[PDB]
Point group: D2
Chain length 507, copies 4
């Protein structure tokens, strides 16, 4: 009725230009739709307990990230065990699948085993076994022997989240002769940057296969062959696992297209990326990479220091809420929390804060422009799933459908709806517990795991799943009596046959 069009930034939605849309953004216009941008929370000592995990799932965590940079196999087995128990130990219309993503250690370089490194200073960078625990104000040892044969004269070396810098002078036989460009206090075992896949990563990828992880975040992907190395390490048993390539450096930005082509998705890994390229350029790489993923219809994750101050403070800064909103307006499928959930004092509040901001920012999306641009740049398709998806999203915009309900075996039919960014929630009904977890990578897909064995008559089994979609949607607040819904199905069983879109009112 009349109150409906005041909500979800609908006045700004029907503006005729982007600028007019911005002018019409309204802080009194409340979000209505379910929050659609998935939240990845990193597990660590602040978030390992089963009862804390349950608080985090209630708060809106959709994907748990296991950081293999730190912790033994046994430690990660216990984190996985806890997430499973939290998820299971909540009615099938209420159940929320949580994905498990393993994030590889990758090609880490660490310094040896506090000292002021002074800006005038003459630092030696040695790679000697012998100086491994001899770190002081003038010697940093590293765990990476080829560093001496790889950064020449001039040539800069970063230490500790890029906070300390060194420029090489001579290469004498004791190590690299540097001077401090940027000085500071240095602790032990800090990360080194120098603006394929290791034996540890392979053992970890195999461990993630043994434990059934849903997604791998692959570190430092530079080229297509890096993704193939991961796929090969996962092996035959790991064919179902999604590979999200982490773009962390210059080469991975430049070879982006070839990387996206062979990946399931992308992470903008802003931590390393902001040291490997100038900090002030990261937002260009982020925007470009999100836009190219949106175009390709493949999930993209924005990561790193999004709500960083909430490690120690219960409220985020103005820059942090902005960064989260802007990641969503950029077009990110997923937003991520690292220290904020792994080790901080406010892990649950950090999740609720990304949820609240993401909901606001999704309602602010200018669909009029975004849909037209997605459409007028996607190529023609003779694939019935794609053709149905675009017809289904169009139909939902025409009637302000509360949802599109899609049956899916692998997630693909839901993924192709998601790529057009409907305002309608995509309620994906599947039998596959793994597909249900994995579809959390796609903005606006709300997975529902259907547990019944098949009706004798296939068409009846289809109807029964669509009803389950409807009943879950109601229970969850997605749908009310009188809503229109778009229902997307196929003409026969099995993956790949989606070809039907139907307009239904909810009774």
């Amino acid at each position: 009725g009349t109150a409906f069009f005041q909500q979800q930034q609908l006045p700004a939605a029907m503006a005729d230009t982007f600028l007019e849309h911005l002018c019409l953004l309204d802080i009194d216009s409340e979000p209505v739709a379910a929050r659609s941008t998935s939240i990845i929370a990193t597990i660590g000592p602040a978030s390992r307990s089963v009862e804390r995990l349950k608080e985090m799932i209630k708060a809106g965590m959709n994907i748990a990230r296991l950081n293999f940079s730190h912790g033994s196999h046994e430690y990660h087995a216990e984190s996985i065990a806890n997430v499973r128990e939290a998820v299971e130990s909540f009615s099938p219309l209420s159940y929320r699948p949580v994905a498990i993503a393993l994030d590889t250690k990758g090609p880490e370089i660490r310094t040896g085993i506090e000292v002021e490194l002074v800006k005038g200073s003459q630092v030696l960078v040695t790679v000697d076994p012998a100086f491994r625990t001899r770190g002081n104000a003038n010697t940093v040892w590293v765990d990476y022997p080829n560093i001496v044969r790889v950064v020449p004269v001039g040539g800069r070396i970063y230490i500790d989240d890029g906070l300390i810098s060194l420029v090489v002078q001579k290469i004498g036989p004791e190590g690299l002769v540097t001077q401090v460009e940027n000085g500071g206090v240095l602790g032990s075992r800090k990360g080194v940057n120098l603006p394929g896949l290791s034996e540890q990563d392979v053992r970890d990828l195999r461990f993630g296969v043994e434990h059934g992880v849903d997604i791998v975040f692959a570190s430092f992907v530079r080229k297509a062959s890096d993704v193939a190395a991961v796929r090969a390490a996962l092996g035959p048993e790991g064919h179902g696992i999604k590979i999200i390539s982490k773009i962390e450096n210059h080469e991975g930005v430049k070879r982006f297209d070839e990387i996206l082509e062979v990946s399931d998705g992308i992470m903008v890994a802003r931590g390393d990326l902001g040291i490997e390229i100038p900090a002030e350029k990261v937002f260009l790489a982020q925007k470009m990479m999100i836009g190219r993923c949106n175009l390709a219809g493949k999930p993209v994750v924005c990561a790193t220091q999004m709500l960083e101050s909430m490690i120690t403070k219960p409220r985020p800064t103005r820059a942090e809420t902005s960064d989260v909103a802007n990641a969503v307006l950029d077009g990110a499928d997923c937003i991520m929390l690292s220290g904020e959930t792994a080790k901080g004092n406010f892990p649950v509040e950090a999740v609720k804060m990304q949820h609240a901001i993401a909901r606001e920012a999704e309602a602010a999306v200018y669909h009029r422009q975004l849909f037209e641009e997605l459409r007028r740049a996607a190529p023609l398709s003779r694939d019935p799933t794609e053709v149905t998806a675009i017809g289904a999203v169009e139909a939902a915009f025409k009637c302000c459908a509360a949802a599109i309900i899609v049956l899916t075996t692998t997630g693909r039919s839901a993924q192709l709806l998601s790529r057009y960014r409907p305002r309608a929630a995509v309620i994906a009904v599947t039998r596959s517990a793994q597909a249900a977890r994995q579809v959390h990578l796609c903005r606006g897909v709300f997975p529902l795991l259907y547990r019944e064995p098949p009706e004798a008559i296939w068409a009846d089994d289809v109807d029964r799943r669509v009803q389950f979609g409807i009943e879950s949607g109601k229970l969850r607040g997605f749908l009310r009596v009188g809503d229109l819904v778009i229902v997307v199905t196929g003409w026969r069983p099995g993956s790949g046959y989606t070809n039907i879109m139907r307009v239904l009112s909810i009774s």
Copy 2:
């Protein structure tokens, strides 16, 4: 690429025009309907057969001339010609029959000399003209204007007496018998009401209502057609300044509109007609109601076997403006080349359809159509979106009344809208809508409704193959509904032709 596809991809309208290619052949079936007017040149069954094969979709009966008996013969001859093709149900072409009302006509070789004196009289030569409108002598003041014969002659009153209007010939010419008079400076006539009842009793599909000036003119036509005539479509003829200015209230209550350019271009300056034409076409596109462009489109083809460069341009531009239907009057009613004229409108329309800039046109119509909770409208835009995504050869829709097909048509898909119906009247009537190709299905209902649905879809596909719309490997979008009876369309499916 064929069908002007490289011009279709352009990023601006201006780039689109620059890419138009005279070698890019039309591939699509011709989608703008052709209305031909019946008369001595196009009335015999043998001639009408040739008209139908040349592409005539709507036969216009001009009630300005001809007795009822004459029009009954015209209707029967059209039906005999049309029915002669019924023995091949997958090829049969429904033809609508439109009754075009006489209207408020005023009617009068001799020379009218410029500057000479002419008495206009209604009292029961070069210097005196009689007219069948008695009240003319009291409704034209000094020095109001009297146009005569397609507005080619004009007089200006100087005096009013009981012998009638003393005028001066301002624009002179040669005057024959019983020519049209316009007085740009009545109701629904009594003859019109009798003609409307004739129309109902003879099962006409469409009425073209003359000189519609406001909404209550439309209501009087509906009232005259009566309860028996509820299913007849009313197309309002916009013929004068008042009809232009009251256009929105007229279109609101009408099934659609005719740009009646002959009277319009005497009633307003001839140089303003294209403005009225383009505005009314645009508004009718927006409203999703059929619009007809009429009058003098291929005029010289009355006597010449090929048209002038301006007539081919006028036809092409009427299509590019957005017209659902184009019309031929004296070109088929009385000329020497009625079949060649139909063929010529067919050929031009096909070229101009391919030239349509859908990219912008779809975006505009989509952006301006209001949100809708009606599942037929929702499914229509979804299907037309889908058709564009995969370059579908057709959209097959089942329809009882034509509505589901009209709602597809308003978005101007490039795919043909193949409308499968059991209603013979709906199949005739749907020719009002650009790009709808009606198929009349004659089989009694299958025992199981879902089978009955599928058989009609198959019938759509198999008619489409036979008619050259569809080949193996094409994609089509099928639009149906969830239960029997009109108003339940809600389903769109993507199907490959085998």
Copy 3:
């Protein structure tokens, strides 16, 4: 609320159409030039004065007919008409020579019956012997270039023969499309294969001799056809503008290489609509006008625009539509042939084109047009181009009544016209020829300045701008309180335009 301003501020093209208003009166001066063909109906000095008043801007001499002496007389009458009209009101009229070209004609009324046999003969002894079964053509090699099965069109494409055999006597044909055949009718051989004839060269040099402004060059198929015309004009004809007539398939397909070397284009629809299918002509027209608009070169739409006005005092609905749509397509000039050369209403035809063009100009959707022109022209470091676009934008922003430009060659005015300002472009020039020639560009109103140069160049510049203003006011273009944009340059001589100024009229 005048000049379709409400439809001009629409957000989309379709909304713009929807708001077009027959009550909204044109206020701007009519910008699309009118080219009238000279003939027996329009040759008199009295008649020509009537036509210039009615709006004729360019007189076309049809070299398909009439001797040099006859054309010399036509030229003389146009000049005398123009001169026999007070410098603030003087109207230049260009003279365009339209070449005969590679015309094929029959010999010196009779009927050809569908299905009869007609010999087509090139035997000189048969020239005067045409009848129901015999047509002579002035093209001896026709026998070598139409194979059996090949088609020969006659009389504006109305009659059609198909060759059935070839012998000593000529082409034995069957009448495919019959009709009534007179004398000396045009013949088209669209199936066939074959530059500048000896006649066209004599005609062009006569053009140079009599100071014609513009050549309309027939059947241009390729860039070398334009070079042959420029060469034939020679040393003395360097200043003459060449408008290439696109009249057949090859001229359409080779259009871009033709435009690149031409001063502009004529869409010559008569032959074009025989040489390619009549139903495709509008596609060629709209493409060629669109491409001319993008390149900033003038384009003429021609032939049968108001054909019925040869014998009737008012045009058909199709004809008014065709004139309005040519303007809306982007034509710089529109044209009349038989309607002024031979018809009974030549003054009326000119008045009708003026009336329709003014209405159609006010219906131009400048919002989309200017953006698309802008966003597809390419970057330019030329100061005249940069100033032109700055000046047109400034005109739109304040609904200026005019852009007054000083121009030696016309170029600064042409680069303004290409952005289709709503504002009149009032072009002040000392060059009488440039003043004529710039009628080829839509919306340029040339004023010929006749006073010798002031001692001080800045004062000379300002006096020409004042003359621009006072003429503009006397002619109804400018009112007290109007804004105008004034475009000048930093030093004398062509090529140095670089300054735009915003001025109030008092």
Copy 4:
């Protein structure tokens, strides 16, 4: 010339634009978004302010929440001394504006305890006053203007109490959000005052000390702006008033505020406590949008590079925040604690410079100019007319700059509102206008100091030559560049009507 994100500039759609953004495309344009640095202990000394000016600071902010008039007088003199130390090179001198930021309706607490979540705490206004159970505040009428339950926020809104009861003791509350609490902290009462006598004495002090700009705190409606104007007096008529939008009413009444203000500050600190923190980006993008539309300067403020208070490099969210404020359309970006009190005030200015220059190059002009063009009304003002014509000319030829003469700043401001890519080099004899035009994105003021030439046209030309010469010295312009030059037909403000296209020799 595929530098400055030029290949992304050529894209047909905004989405294609993002896709073509290239980390290898170097900015070439001078940085156009002005940087406001707050003065305080870390950035107050003459030698430090010289480094700040060299790093890019364009406007020094005096924060009147803290410090005596003596303090601020010294801050003003120090800035002038640092700025005038570069005056002996008039072809390179950088004018620096001084903005006085008012205290406003500040509530502070008493004179480091910790407030336990769910414990009871009395808020008191009894003169004879704290600790874990008692917080004193300097706003007597608080006890009267917060009903049960109603929320009290303390310390950048990190602590919150909910009132259960009102007694003569004051407000007995329960700690809703607990936290560690120190001396004299900011208090906010969302949904509860006038311009204060302190603020009036402060405005008069700013007038007497020639400040360029006032940032007026908590503007809630048009009459709040009239009150500032009245308090500046006749002597302060040329000071620019920048309204700070800091609460819900200010957002809702934004239009009547903008109408009477010289421009706007998105004062994110208070705004993000007064309305839900998650809604601030909506108010930010709306207010910037509307200020772009109106052609009036807008400032994004607060916590933009917060962590640089203590770290030499910012977080990934801070650099994104700066870049996005520029992309949103901000004329100026601000540093507060980062320069007033942090350990890296010069690095923080350098970082905002570096990020702004990148973000400026990524602006999608093709869309933004079209939108700004199509939405600006028709105008018969020759200055407006000439401005849009100069900006379209500058795009046609990728002009290196537009050089404009201006007395008040206005002709430069009307070029800046179309967001040219060309730098707007504004030559003026007015030292205050030269300072003030830093409020407008992409205006580089040049202060001209020579007496007028006898012949005015010569004087005009000489100032244009000086625009060029500074442009060349400063790296804006090279031999062969094209420039658009905007001048007027007579002396005195308001007659700009001429645009010329010139080659640089």
